[PDB]
Design a protein around this ligand. Structure first.
Ligand code: MG
Ligand code: MG
Length: 66
RNA sequence: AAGUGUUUAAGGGCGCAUGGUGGAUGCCUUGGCACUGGGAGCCGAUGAAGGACGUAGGAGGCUGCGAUAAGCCUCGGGG
């Protein structure tokens, strides 16, 4: 739901805030699926990829590639 | 009266006609084998070769991947 272009616009601290937010959303989704009340299975994959994106961007800024 | 003489198949054999079992034969192939012309001839403490355990919305194997886990970013191809 968020693209690498938009992520590169946020400050370092805003990215870390978004990473916590996504981890909380993933946690809620896992519980909803264990309870069997989650209709859209695909939200798990998308949230997980969103976490991976934020990590990638953060690492690029440390390595000086951005 | 004396004499002649067919007439059983419990089961078996042989032939033929129809089947079963079995997977030979013919015709094949996603696999092999032997080589030819090139490439590259090393990988590893910046943790290798090879593995364990994990990883997808649903059990397991093979494949891919590593808690960013059948994937993340960028540059090109493609349609
Ligand atoms: Mg050498
Ligand atoms: Mg492209």
């Amino acid at each position: 739901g968020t693209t690498p272009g938009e992520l590169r616009e946020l400050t370092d601290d805003e990215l870390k805030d978004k990473l916590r937010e996504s981890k909380e959303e993933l946690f809620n989704l896992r519980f909803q699926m264990a309870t069997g009340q989650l209709s859209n299975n695909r939200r798990l994959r998308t949230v997980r990829q969103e976490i991976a994106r934020v990590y990638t961007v953060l690492r690029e800024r440390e390595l000086g590639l951005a």
